[PDB]
Amino acid sequence: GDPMFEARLGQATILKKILDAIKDLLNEATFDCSDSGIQLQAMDNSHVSLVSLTLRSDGFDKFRCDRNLSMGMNLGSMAKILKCANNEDNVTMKAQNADTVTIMFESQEKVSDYEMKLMNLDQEHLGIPSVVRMPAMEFARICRDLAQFSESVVICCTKGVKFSASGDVGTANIKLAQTEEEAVIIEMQEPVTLTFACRYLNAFTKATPLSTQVQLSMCADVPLVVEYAIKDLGHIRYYLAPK
Template sequence: MLELRLVQGSLLKKVMEAIKDLVNDANFDCSATGFSLQAMDSSHVALVALLLRSEGFEHYRCDRNISMGMNLNNMSKMLKCAGNDDIITLKADDGSDTVTFMFESPTQDKISDFEMKLMDIDSEHLGIPEAEYHAIVRMPSAEFARICKDLSSIGDTVVISVTKEGVKFSTRGDIGTANIVCRQNTTVDKPEEATIIEMNEPVSLTFALRYMNSFTKATPLSSMVTISLSSELPVVVEYKIAEMGYIRFYLAPKIEEDEDETKP
């Protein structure tokens, strides 16, 4: 028996919007500690990890660990039927092959039930080791989204370089090149406008902007984004979900080769 009641239903909607473009089908794993998901995109270049801790739910009951395979597009369709202010309750019986989403309007005068079929998905759960990152950049998520969007109109890849100067996003395309440098800025009035750079050593990595752009779909979840870079690890783009957990995107860097320099 599984029953999760989330007062802030819009949060689940935003989560779905953030990951449904990257992943088609995924297993949602429910345990006593929380509701989580880990999935790779179909090309195995990016990985998304979601955690919604049980504390964040108004009511959380999970009798035994359960893994529910869902088509995220279908789930997103169902969740779109929920109002932004609705309270969403997820329910599943043990051994059942369906999950039920119940939407309650804030005034309790409308209650909708949506039952969705589950699917069997072969999940490849990856162990993600804790790692020390060479550089960690915290910046406003909207700013990051803007940068990715802008750069993707010029090139396909972004080089993220963190130096003591700041963090530089650069790209090149047929029409030219672009460089955006964000300096550390902690003196703003609002903490959510700060750009904080922690750097142990300089790092420069190349990523596909296509993925970065789909990561930024999670921007509504958090005002800040944390980008953790290490030269031999995938970048981590993390959006904290207030009081509940996080959504993290891992993206394998592009392999840099020497002839990059020789290319025209």
């Protein structure tokens, strides 16, 4: 007919994990689809952090976008649909204009199609705002652990990075020297020390299954950026202002 969006990923789990990385920060968001792929930018529910997702067209098995379109979606509903996909299902999203989007899983003997209504969301009015590379699971463990001591974590980087927290339980200091991964790589001129809200760092680490290395961009006075590479596809970035 005329005109359509259709994007096919080889593995549904990639999309399931992308949704896990944002669903607890955003109950709804808009996916902007264009020739170059899919992007999302939104303030979290509490309007503190900024979430920015980039998926490139060249990482899809099939990508067609006849005209630019934006799909406002309930992320909770989208998560429930992605829960229905098996381990080696692909996932196709199609939007006829739209009032709905369709999500399709295929493997073989099983074909599943799901149809979800589209919103209807306002444009966000946003501004998107140096670095240390280290294991994603180590960053996640450190943030989980230090949260036991305090709602704030001090990050102090030289060229090693130190994560600190203190409170009733006691005072904690975790020091990682510069060395699937265990490599800790640091790029710094002037040392930086900043304090961040643990509850937000811990939300960011829901992106952990997407990447074995995480990137922290931390200059003084300006938001930290936490970045997870999505293999052969793009990345998610979280922006968080220091205290």
